[PDB]
């Protein structure tokens, strides 16, 4: 896949939240990335998922680079699965991260050169 | 459009004694986790082994 | 109470959220309004509380 088939592939996300309903927060858990008609070539053909996001105290870090998880499609137990990047196996602290704060997740071809594909600036 | 999927071979009507049929589950295609929407239009296409396809349920 | 000591009681408040664990959107549910050493007056001055909001189809109203 060349670097914009890969670009596209990562388009249609579903942040998996966590809410604390005391400051009701919602933390981010991790990422789905969707499946579409066009895009099962070029989501295969990743992982690894480079991740850099704001934690909740000590903000915006590296949390390392981990491989994905293959979970199906927003829970449905009848969707296909998909690349999923949960972010609570990361190198946090144990800490939370921190929705609409900044969160950046780099896509890591195995020729290990990296995309941007998900920015929540 | 939301993609062309194998049939599933479910009990008719969920009964355990009628044989198992066709199945058509559109809870599996390309949904994006969305709701497929009553009396509004469907069309459902048979896919022959030859590649042909046919139209054998309108909702319209 | 002056108009501005009653926009001040009003400073700090908390809403009551409602999160919905598919679109997590979290709607609001309410509001409260801090009880604290100097607000009291102002805050048991008032009632009625108009409210405009945007709701989840037909918007601002």
Redesign the interface.
């Known amino acids: 896949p060349t670097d914009q088939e890969i670009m596209d592939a990562h388009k249609?996300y579903?942040?998996d939240?966590n809410?604390n309903?005391s400051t009701?927060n919602?933390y981010i858990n991790g990422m789905y990335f969707?499946?579409?008609?066009t895009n099962k070539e070029a989501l295969d053909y990743i992982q690894k998922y480079r991740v850099e996001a704001t934690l909740q105290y000590s903000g915006f870090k590296d949390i390392g680079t981990k491989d994905k998880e293959m979970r199906n499609?927003?829970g449905?137990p009848?969707?296909?699965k998909t690349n999923y990047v949960n972010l609570r196996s990361y190198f946090t602290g144990g800490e939370n991260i921190m929705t609409y704060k900044k969160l950046r997740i780099y896509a890591i071809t195995p020729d290990d050169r990296e995309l941007l594909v998900l920015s929540v600036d």
């Open positions: 249609i579903f942040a939240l809410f309903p009701g919602t969707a499946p579409t008609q499609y927003l449905d009848n969707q296909p």
